[PDB]
Amino acid sequence: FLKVKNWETEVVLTDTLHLKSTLETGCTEYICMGSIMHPSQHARRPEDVATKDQLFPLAKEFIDQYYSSIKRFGSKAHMERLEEVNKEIDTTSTYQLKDTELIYGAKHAWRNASRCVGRIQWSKLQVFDARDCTTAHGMFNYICNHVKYATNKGNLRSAITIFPQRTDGKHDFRVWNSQLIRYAGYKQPDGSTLGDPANVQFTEICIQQGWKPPRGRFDVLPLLLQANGNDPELFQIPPELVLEVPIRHPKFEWFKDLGLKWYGLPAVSNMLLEIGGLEFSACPFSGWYMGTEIGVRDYCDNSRYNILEEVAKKMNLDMRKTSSLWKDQALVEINIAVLYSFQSDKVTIVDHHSATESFIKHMENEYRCRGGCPADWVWIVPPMSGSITPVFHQEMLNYRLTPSFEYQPDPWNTHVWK
Template sequence: MAETAMPGAADTARPRCPVQARRTDGVAGVTELSAEARRFLLDDETPVDGDREQRLAAALAEIRATGGYRQTTAELAHGCRVAWRNHARCVGRLHWKALRVVDRRDAASAEEVFAACVDHLRLATNGGRLQPVVTVFGQRSPDGSGPRIWNPQLVRYAGYARPGGGVVGDPLHVELTAVAGSLGWRGTGGPFDVLPLIVQMPGEEPRWFPLPGDAVLEVELVHPDLPWFAELGLRWHAVPAISDMLLEIGGVEYPACPFNGWYVGYEIGARNLADTDRYDMLPRVAAGMGLDTGRDDTLWKDVALIEINRAVLHSFHRAGVHIVDHHTVTRQFVTHEEREKRRGRATPTDRDWIVPPLSASTTPVFHRTYTNAAVRPNYHRQPPAWR
């Protein structure tokens, strides 16, 4: 979902549709929430303890009294998994049933949210045998407030704007780096400085927390055939844990719900490291290979792009960290489509996100047609919290 981060989550800066806070303290808001609660709780898929109509009646009474309702742990877990299954931009949905759901709706302070995020990273990393995890914090109140994690992912690299132009580090995160600096954080100024986690609780100022080193697994990138590649000093973090999206289940909104799967190689090799507005490594790799970069028709960009992606896959495998290539993950996606079809369900798909940016026509998804639809439960983008 990445940048959806479930398996196949594109780790990019492509534009997304933001979701605004939905207030439920008015008649229209309560009516909409009640309708969504009814649809979710009466769905035969939803695990409900006891009589389904009685459960719905209790939820509707709670909505009338408080403007919201609290879902059971079983309802929450099911909603998280179905939200992944429904997310049109994730190519890795074959594994939706394996999502591990951590219910931390009890976290009442920024310290507790941060500690739970650190636990999330350790659980997801699993010694390199990555496992999909979502940690869900408190739901949004009727007035629209709720806990927020400001970082787009739990692990992100800082971007330092140079006074004379250019950026050291990740240009995608220059603004967030400046925000962290305004809160008192100071990085080393290096190209792969891990940003602190910024947490904001309702009614409080945002606070930053440094991630402990043992919670952030990183992979140093080397190439199987080009020894000089290691001298580039490239690395990337192992767990792509999206942390700024909103989870909506049965009308209830959870504005802080970090979730992860594992990387598809091209997310790192063809986007994060290769895009001209990110680390822009194609010219340096081409120079190291002695390629003719004077003309586009030498296809030097294509050759360099393939070698960066080879390095990423080789390095993750060498380090014992799970990653998947674009051929494998797209075959898995087709398997998921066929399974869903046999179960009488459609697979909403945003083709721009499912077809890989690398060797697209060699993958099975390139030759298929897709229909996108907004379905619920689902994960949605939110505007950056600092704006």
């Protein structure tokens, strides 16, 4: 047993779920790696060509968990499923999930994502089975339908589309984009950057693949889709599917003249979904934004759009010294505008006060029914106004449960072209 305490309310919770932890965190009793971005390379099966004694134990564990989840441990269907997975592995070196197992696994990977403040929503996830896909054109069709369903004219719905699992590591399906909808970034001749600097490398690959860049500040990037290990292919998302929000301020009339906008649907497309030893290398998932992601990180990181200096100018703030807090003052105003703008256009968004409150409630729920909730304080606490949100004062235990979402390498570092 391990207790976590909220230092604002004095609520103490007791964690037993961590006893089911599978993978190393990176920490030891002598060193804590809680702020390392990727602390551990402890995986569940070697790189590929997993033998029977390597894959079957992972499959048995997942099937066991699913059938226990539904109160059917030891049932005929459970025992039948085990022998079924045994035969498939024997005859194909892999196995295939039932539709129910796939949905269960995708929801539990989200439920297990310790870095995610949005998991109160975890069991409301629309799962699109795209395991019949064979080509980049088919991937594009599946993605377009995902975007259209999830956007829902601004009433955003959480969804995930699951493309065929990895077989041998040479026939991977991959979305080369980091998100389905991102803005381009361009290296200027003098040395500055136009657009989004995070995406300069990916933009150059698109350009180097034939994409004609409009060379603007908010150029929706094309999709670069790889099916069955083949060379990736470019597709333009139909603009009527890409919902965008112009950013204005409820007090500063001049704010709109900064020419800022952002897109409504965040859709992460470069993670790997791991279920029962199976690896889904293309599994784009989407929900909706917390305001700070755009207002604090996308707009105000120094290596991102870096707009703090410009906003502070128009606000006529004393920018001579840091102690005037001109950065902090402009940062607030920017995040007010982002929220006001989304809310004005009826595009789903959550502020960091409401999101963190919801997450404290989700923590309650999880400790009550499940005996714990893995949570990464470093990621859960919002990047502004940390201590006036409830999660700042909440102790959290972090451990790794399966199914899960994992990082994976950018495919241009590993793909051999044709």
